[PDB]
Design a protein around this ligand. Structure first.
Ligand SMILES: CC(C)C[C@H](CC(=O)NO)C(=O)N[C@@H](CC(C)C)C(=O)N[C@@H](Cc1ccccc1)C(N)=O
Ligand SMILES: [Ca+2]
Ligand SMILES: [Zn+2]
Ligand SMILES: [Zn+2]
Length: 166
């Protein structure tokens, strides 16, 4: 698949992200916080260091839409998941649009801009898709591992242990 070694299309252990827009269901700042947390443990695992936009383009920049836009996995509307993204290279390199349609939350679930952010931050680089418990590749927004020490996927091992190449 994607990912590894020495990192994809940016050989620096100092990368960035940017919420292009923000869907104004949770605070803009809370949707940013949903993403920004994702980053936070992605940086614990790989040697990389993510943060909001330094300059220019980024690794993964995230917009907001869904309500029948025509992209990847869009428009299932509030509740479910919904980053309807593209990989590192594909889209606006590392692209993700969060169900703008939602009513961003954490009713244990509903939807949290947070985990699809991980599914996006991750989807871009290349640990993209697997089937394990602790993983960000795990099926949904009942994020077991929780982003504090999010010990991501089994592909996160054979992906993020590449990212940290430098
Ligand atoms: C952790 C999550 C953010 C990413 C995962 C896993 C993945 O990589 N899919 O490609 C996901 O997209 N799961 C979707 C698959 C698809 C819709 C994109 C899903 O199962 N969504 C749940 C949403 C949900 C939420 C609340 C309750 C129950 C279910 C569903 N529609 O069954
Ligand atoms: Ca949804
Ligand atoms: Zn879109
Ligand atoms: Zn996926």
């Amino acid at each position: 698949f994607r990912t590894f070694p020495g990192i994809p299309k940016w050989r620096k252990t100092h990368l960035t992200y940017r919420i292009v827009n923000y869907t104004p269901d949770l605070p803009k700042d809370a949707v940013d916080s949903a993403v920004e947390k994702a980053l936070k443990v992605w940086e614990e695992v790989t040697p990389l260091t993510f943060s909001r936009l330094y300059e220019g383009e980024a690794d993964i920049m995230i917009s907001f839409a869904v309500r029948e836009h025509g992209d990847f996995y869009p428009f299932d509307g509030p509740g479910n998941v919904l980053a309807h993204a593209y990989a590192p290279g594909p889209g606006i390199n590392g692209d993700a649009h969060f169900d703008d349609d939602e009513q961003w939350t954490k009713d244990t679930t509903g939807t949290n801009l947070f985990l699809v952010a991980a599914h996006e931050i991750g989807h871009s680089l290349g640990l993209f898709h697997s089937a394990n418990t602790e993983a960000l590749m795990y099926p949904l927004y009942h994020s077991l591992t929780d982003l504090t020490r999010f010990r991501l996927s089994q592909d996160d091992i054979n992906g993020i242990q590449s990212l940290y190449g430098p």
